Design a protein around this motif. Structure first.
Motif, short mmCIF file in Angstrom:
data_model
loop_
_atom_site.label_atom_id
_atom_site.label_comp_id
_atom_site.label_asym_id
_atom_site.label_seq_id
_atom_site.Cartn_x
_atom_site.Cartn_y
_atom_site.Cartn_z
N UNK A 161 38.18 29.32 37.92
CA UNK A 161 39.53 28.84 37.71
C UNK A 161 39.57 27.68 36.72
N UNK A 212 48.31 45.45 39.92
CA UNK A 212 47.72 45.34 38.59
C UNK A 212 46.26 45.79 38.53
N UNK A 219 43.18 46.13 35.71
CA UNK A 219 42.67 45.82 34.39
C UNK A 219 41.16 46.00 34.41
N UNK A 253 43.14 40.30 27.91
CA UNK A 253 41.79 40.79 28.04
C UNK A 253 41.01 40.42 26.79
N UNK A 261 39.17 45.57 37.64
CA UNK A 261 39.73 44.55 38.51
C UNK A 261 41.08 44.98 39.06
N UNK A 274 33.75 34.97 38.04
CA UNK A 274 35.08 34.45 38.34
C UNK A 274 35.08 32.93 38.26
N UNK A 278 36.78 42.94 42.36
CA UNK A 278 36.14 43.45 41.16
C UNK A 278 35.31 44.66 41.53
N UNK A 335 35.47 40.29 46.34
CA UNK A 335 36.90 40.00 46.30
C UNK A 335 37.23 38.94 45.27
N UNK A 336 38.52 38.75 45.02
CA UNK A 336 38.98 37.75 44.07
C UNK A 336 38.85 36.37 44.70
N UNK A 337 38.77 35.33 43.87
CA UNK A 337 38.65 33.96 44.37
C UNK A 337 39.99 33.46 44.89
N UNK A 365 29.02 39.99 37.26
CA UNK A 365 30.45 39.77 37.19
C UNK A 365 30.69 38.27 37.35
N UNK A 413 46.92 49.01 33.90
CA UNK A 413 47.84 49.91 34.55
C UNK A 413 48.33 49.33 35.86
N UNK A 422 48.24 40.99 28.97
CA UNK A 422 48.36 41.67 30.25
C UNK A 422 49.67 42.46 30.27
N UNK A 423 49.75 43.47 31.13
CA UNK A 423 50.95 44.29 31.24
C UNK A 423 52.04 43.56 32.02
N UNK A 443 43.18 31.75 36.42
CA UNK A 443 42.14 32.66 36.89
C UNK A 443 41.39 33.35 35.77
N UNK A 498 38.29 36.17 35.31
CA UNK A 498 37.42 37.16 35.92
C UNK A 498 36.88 38.06 34.82
N UNK A 537 44.35 43.48 41.33
CA UNK A 537 44.99 42.31 41.92
C UNK A 537 46.05 42.80 42.89
N UNK A 592 38.83 38.54 31.56
CA UNK A 592 40.27 38.56 31.78
C UNK A 592 40.77 37.19 32.20
#
Ligand SMILES: CCCCCC(=O)OC[C@H](O)COP(=O)(O)O
Ligand SMILES: CCCCCC(=O)OC[C@H](O)COP(=O)(O)O
Lengths: 118, 118
Positions: free
Chosen positions: A50, B37, B39, A14, B32, A48, B14, B116-118, A46, B49, A117-118, A37, A39, B34, A32
Protein backbone atom coordinates in the motif's frame (compact mmCIF):
# COMPACT_ATOMS: atom_id res chain seq x y z
CA UNK A 1 11.89 12.85 -19.87
CA UNK A 2 11.72 11.35 -16.39
CA UNK A 3 11.45 13.65 -13.36
CA UNK A 4 11.51 13.04 -9.57
CA UNK A 5 7.92 12.52 -8.41
CA UNK A 6 6.01 10.89 -5.59
CA UNK A 7 5.38 7.27 -6.55
CA UNK A 8 1.87 7.95 -5.29
CA UNK A 9 1.25 10.14 -8.34
CA UNK A 10 1.16 7.04 -10.55
CA UNK A 11 -2.00 6.85 -12.67
CA UNK A 12 -4.28 3.95 -11.77
CA UNK A 13 -4.07 1.02 -14.14
CA UNK A 14 -2.07 -1.96 -15.27
CA UNK A 15 1.68 -1.70 -15.76
CA UNK A 16 4.29 -3.82 -17.50
CA UNK A 17 7.43 -4.33 -15.45
CA UNK A 18 11.05 -5.35 -15.97
CA UNK A 19 13.69 -5.63 -13.27
CA UNK A 20 17.25 -6.67 -12.53
CA UNK A 21 18.72 -7.58 -9.15
CA UNK A 22 22.16 -7.07 -7.65
CA UNK A 23 22.75 -10.74 -8.52
CA UNK A 24 22.44 -9.57 -12.12
CA UNK A 25 19.27 -11.60 -12.75
CA UNK A 26 16.31 -10.30 -14.76
CA UNK A 27 12.58 -10.79 -14.45
CA UNK A 28 9.39 -9.44 -16.02
CA UNK A 29 5.88 -9.15 -14.66
CA UNK A 30 2.65 -7.26 -14.25
CA UNK A 31 1.76 -4.58 -11.71
CA UNK A 32 -1.66 -3.16 -10.84
CA UNK A 33 -2.36 0.08 -8.98
CA UNK A 34 -5.80 0.97 -7.67
CA UNK A 35 -6.12 3.51 -4.87
CA UNK A 36 -2.99 3.13 -2.79
CA UNK A 37 -3.21 -0.62 -3.38
CA UNK A 38 -0.45 -2.25 -5.39
CA UNK A 39 -0.68 -5.86 -6.48
CA UNK A 40 1.29 -7.75 -9.09
CA UNK A 41 3.40 -10.79 -9.81
CA UNK A 42 5.37 -12.88 -12.27
CA UNK A 43 5.71 -16.58 -13.06
CA UNK A 44 7.29 -17.32 -9.67
CA UNK A 45 6.19 -14.66 -7.17
CA UNK A 46 3.38 -12.23 -6.42
CA UNK A 47 3.43 -8.92 -4.56
CA UNK A 48 1.17 -6.59 -2.64
CA UNK A 49 1.68 -3.28 -0.89
CA UNK A 50 0.00 0.00 0.00
CA UNK A 51 1.42 3.33 -1.14
CA UNK A 52 2.44 4.77 2.21
CA UNK A 53 2.89 8.54 2.55
CA UNK A 54 3.55 8.82 6.27
CA UNK A 55 5.25 5.44 6.46
CA UNK A 56 7.83 3.40 4.55
CA UNK A 57 6.22 1.71 1.54
CA UNK A 58 6.55 -2.02 2.18
CA UNK A 59 6.02 -4.36 -0.76
CA UNK A 60 5.25 -7.90 0.41
CA UNK A 61 6.75 -10.48 -1.94
CA UNK A 62 5.44 -14.04 -1.80
CA UNK A 63 7.11 -16.81 -3.77
CA UNK A 64 4.48 -19.22 -5.12
CA UNK A 65 6.66 -21.30 -7.45
CA UNK A 66 9.93 -22.67 -6.08
CA UNK A 67 10.62 -24.65 -9.25
CA UNK A 68 11.68 -21.31 -10.70
CA UNK A 69 14.63 -19.25 -9.40
CA UNK A 70 14.19 -15.94 -7.63
CA UNK A 71 15.82 -12.85 -9.10
CA UNK A 72 17.27 -12.44 -5.58
CA UNK A 73 17.83 -16.09 -4.63
CA UNK A 74 16.18 -15.57 -1.25
CA UNK A 75 14.26 -18.87 -1.33
CA UNK A 76 11.41 -17.55 0.84
CA UNK A 77 9.01 -14.65 1.40
CA UNK A 78 10.54 -11.23 1.98
CA UNK A 79 9.90 -7.50 1.91
CA UNK A 80 11.01 -4.77 -0.47
CA UNK A 81 11.16 -1.11 0.53
CA UNK A 82 9.57 1.10 -2.12
CA UNK A 83 11.08 4.62 -2.43
CA UNK A 84 8.81 7.59 -1.73
CA UNK A 85 10.24 9.35 -4.78
CA UNK A 86 10.56 7.98 -8.31
CA UNK A 87 11.78 9.17 -11.71
CA UNK A 88 8.72 9.17 -13.95
CA UNK A 89 6.54 10.40 -16.79
CA UNK A 90 2.81 9.97 -17.21
CA UNK A 91 3.47 6.49 -18.60
CA UNK A 92 6.93 5.55 -17.34
CA UNK A 93 8.90 5.24 -14.13
CA UNK A 94 11.92 3.55 -12.63
CA UNK A 95 12.94 2.86 -9.05
CA UNK A 96 15.53 1.10 -6.94
CA UNK A 97 14.06 -1.25 -4.33
CA UNK A 98 16.16 -2.98 -1.68
CA UNK A 99 15.23 -5.81 0.66
CA UNK A 100 14.11 -4.46 4.03
CA UNK A 101 17.07 -4.78 6.38
CA UNK A 102 19.72 -5.28 3.71
CA UNK A 103 20.38 -2.56 1.14
CA UNK A 104 22.89 -4.85 -0.58
CA UNK A 105 19.94 -6.90 -1.87
CA UNK A 106 17.97 -4.96 -4.46
CA UNK A 107 16.28 -4.74 -7.82
CA UNK A 108 16.08 -1.88 -10.30
CA UNK A 109 12.61 -1.65 -11.80
CA UNK A 110 11.28 -0.10 -15.00
CA UNK A 111 7.51 0.23 -15.20
CA UNK A 112 5.49 1.03 -18.31
CA UNK A 113 1.83 2.05 -18.24
CA UNK A 114 -0.36 -0.25 -20.32
CA UNK A 115 -3.97 0.80 -19.69
CA UNK A 116 -6.31 2.22 -17.04
CA UNK A 117 -8.71 0.20 -14.91
CA UNK A 118 -12.25 -0.50 -16.15
CA UNK B 1 -13.07 -32.23 -6.11
CA UNK B 2 -14.33 -29.58 -8.52
CA UNK B 3 -18.04 -28.75 -8.67
CA UNK B 4 -20.15 -26.47 -10.91
CA UNK B 5 -20.33 -23.04 -9.27
CA UNK B 6 -20.90 -19.43 -10.20
CA UNK B 7 -17.56 -17.92 -11.17
CA UNK B 8 -18.68 -15.01 -9.02
CA UNK B 9 -18.20 -17.17 -5.93
CA UNK B 10 -14.41 -16.96 -6.35
CA UNK B 11 -12.65 -15.75 -3.20
CA UNK B 12 -10.97 -12.38 -3.57
CA UNK B 13 -7.23 -12.52 -4.06
CA UNK B 14 -4.41 -13.27 -6.44
CA UNK B 15 -4.50 -16.33 -8.65
CA UNK B 16 -1.94 -18.25 -10.68
CA UNK B 17 -3.14 -19.16 -14.15
CA UNK B 18 -2.27 -21.61 -16.92
CA UNK B 19 -4.06 -21.92 -20.25
CA UNK B 20 -4.01 -23.62 -23.63
CA UNK B 21 -5.72 -22.44 -26.81
CA UNK B 22 -7.32 -24.32 -29.69
CA UNK B 23 -4.07 -23.64 -31.56
CA UNK B 24 -2.49 -25.87 -28.93
CA UNK B 25 -0.37 -23.05 -27.48
CA UNK B 26 0.22 -22.58 -23.75
CA UNK B 27 0.62 -19.52 -21.57
CA UNK B 28 0.89 -18.66 -17.89
CA UNK B 29 0.00 -15.52 -15.98
CA UNK B 30 -1.49 -13.81 -12.96
CA UNK B 31 -5.11 -12.95 -12.22
CA UNK B 32 -6.54 -10.65 -9.56
CA UNK B 33 -10.13 -10.54 -8.33
CA UNK B 34 -11.46 -7.75 -6.13
CA UNK B 35 -15.18 -7.11 -5.99
CA UNK B 36 -16.50 -8.06 -9.40
CA UNK B 37 -13.33 -6.59 -10.91
CA UNK B 38 -10.96 -8.96 -12.65
CA UNK B 39 -7.55 -7.81 -13.82
CA UNK B 40 -4.53 -9.83 -14.86
CA UNK B 41 -1.94 -10.40 -17.53
CA UNK B 42 1.13 -12.24 -18.75
CA UNK B 43 4.37 -11.31 -20.53
CA UNK B 44 2.52 -10.29 -23.70
CA UNK B 45 -1.04 -9.31 -22.80
CA UNK B 46 -3.17 -7.94 -19.96
CA UNK B 47 -6.85 -8.40 -19.21
CA UNK B 48 -9.73 -6.74 -17.40
CA UNK B 49 -13.37 -7.60 -16.92
CA UNK B 50 -16.27 -7.34 -14.50
CA UNK B 51 -18.04 -10.42 -13.19
CA UNK B 52 -21.43 -9.97 -14.83
CA UNK B 53 -24.46 -11.74 -13.35
CA UNK B 54 -27.22 -10.32 -15.52
CA UNK B 55 -24.98 -9.98 -18.56
CA UNK B 56 -22.34 -11.96 -20.45
CA UNK B 57 -18.97 -11.72 -18.69
CA UNK B 58 -16.67 -9.99 -21.17
CA UNK B 59 -12.94 -10.17 -20.55
CA UNK B 60 -11.07 -7.45 -22.44
CA UNK B 61 -7.69 -8.68 -23.65
CA UNK B 62 -5.08 -6.12 -24.65
CA UNK B 63 -1.81 -7.17 -26.27
CA UNK B 64 1.03 -4.98 -25.01
CA UNK B 65 3.99 -6.92 -26.43
CA UNK B 66 3.86 -7.93 -30.09
CA UNK B 67 7.43 -9.26 -30.00
CA UNK B 68 5.88 -12.27 -28.28
CA UNK B 69 3.31 -14.58 -29.92
CA UNK B 70 -0.31 -14.74 -28.79
CA UNK B 71 -1.70 -18.05 -27.56
CA UNK B 72 -4.47 -17.36 -30.12
CA UNK B 73 -2.44 -15.66 -32.87
CA UNK B 74 -5.00 -12.86 -33.15
CA UNK B 75 -2.40 -10.08 -33.49
CA UNK B 76 -4.64 -7.44 -31.92
CA UNK B 77 -7.02 -6.66 -29.05
CA UNK B 78 -10.03 -8.93 -28.61
CA UNK B 79 -12.69 -10.14 -26.20
CA UNK B 80 -13.15 -13.44 -24.37
CA UNK B 81 -16.52 -14.58 -23.07
CA UNK B 82 -16.27 -15.83 -19.49
CA UNK B 83 -18.74 -18.62 -18.55
CA UNK B 84 -21.25 -17.91 -15.80
CA UNK B 85 -20.58 -21.35 -14.34
CA UNK B 86 -17.21 -22.90 -13.50
CA UNK B 87 -15.87 -26.13 -12.03
CA UNK B 88 -14.16 -25.16 -8.79
CA UNK B 89 -13.03 -25.67 -5.21
CA UNK B 90 -12.18 -23.02 -2.65
CA UNK B 91 -8.73 -22.73 -4.21
CA UNK B 92 -9.11 -24.14 -7.73
CA UNK B 93 -11.16 -23.69 -10.87
CA UNK B 94 -11.13 -24.30 -14.60
CA UNK B 95 -13.09 -22.78 -17.44
CA UNK B 96 -13.40 -22.74 -21.22
CA UNK B 97 -13.32 -19.25 -22.72
CA UNK B 98 -13.99 -18.57 -26.40
CA UNK B 99 -13.42 -15.39 -28.39
CA UNK B 100 -16.61 -13.34 -28.61
CA UNK B 101 -18.15 -14.06 -32.00
CA UNK B 102 -16.15 -17.20 -32.77
CA UNK B 103 -16.46 -20.24 -30.52
CA UNK B 104 -13.77 -21.98 -32.58
CA UNK B 105 -11.21 -19.67 -30.95
CA UNK B 106 -10.77 -20.50 -27.28
CA UNK B 107 -8.54 -21.21 -24.31
CA UNK B 108 -8.97 -23.65 -21.45
CA UNK B 109 -7.91 -22.07 -18.18
CA UNK B 110 -6.81 -23.52 -14.85
CA UNK B 111 -6.68 -21.07 -11.97
CA UNK B 112 -5.03 -21.67 -8.59
CA UNK B 113 -5.59 -19.44 -5.55
CA UNK B 114 -2.37 -17.99 -4.19
CA UNK B 115 -3.32 -15.51 -1.46
CA UNK B 116 -6.00 -13.01 -0.42
CA UNK B 117 -5.81 -9.25 -0.89
CA UNK B 118 -4.23 -7.08 1.82
C1 LIG C 1 5.71 -0.56 -6.98
C2 LIG C 1 6.99 -0.87 -7.71
C3 LIG C 1 7.20 -2.34 -8.05
C4 LIG C 1 8.14 -3.00 -7.05
C5 LIG C 1 9.06 -3.98 -7.78
C6 LIG C 1 8.69 -5.43 -7.52
O1 LIG C 1 7.74 -5.75 -6.80
O2 LIG C 1 9.50 -6.46 -8.17
C7 LIG C 1 9.26 -7.86 -8.01
C8 LIG C 1 10.52 -8.54 -7.50
O3 LIG C 1 11.61 -8.37 -8.41
C9 LIG C 1 10.21 -10.03 -7.33
O4 LIG C 1 11.44 -10.76 -7.22
P1 LIG C 1 11.45 -12.37 -7.10
O5 LIG C 1 10.48 -12.88 -8.13
O6 LIG C 1 12.86 -12.84 -7.40
O7 LIG C 1 11.03 -12.66 -5.68
C1 LIG D 1 -11.52 -14.98 -15.25
C2 LIG D 1 -10.87 -16.17 -15.93
C3 LIG D 1 -9.58 -15.85 -16.67
C4 LIG D 1 -9.83 -15.71 -18.16
C5 LIG D 1 -8.68 -16.33 -18.94
C6 LIG D 1 -7.76 -15.30 -19.56
O1 LIG D 1 -7.95 -14.08 -19.43
O2 LIG D 1 -6.62 -15.79 -20.34
C7 LIG D 1 -5.68 -14.91 -20.97
C8 LIG D 1 -5.60 -15.23 -22.46
O3 LIG D 1 -5.18 -16.60 -22.67
C9 LIG D 1 -4.59 -14.28 -23.10
O4 LIG D 1 -4.21 -14.78 -24.38
P1 LIG D 1 -3.11 -14.02 -25.29
O5 LIG D 1 -1.97 -13.65 -24.37
O6 LIG D 1 -2.65 -15.00 -26.36
O7 LIG D 1 -3.83 -12.82 -25.86
Amino acid sequence: GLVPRGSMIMKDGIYSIIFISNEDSCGEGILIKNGNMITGGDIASVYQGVLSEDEDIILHVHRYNYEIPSVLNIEQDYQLVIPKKVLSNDNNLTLHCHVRGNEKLFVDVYAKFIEPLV
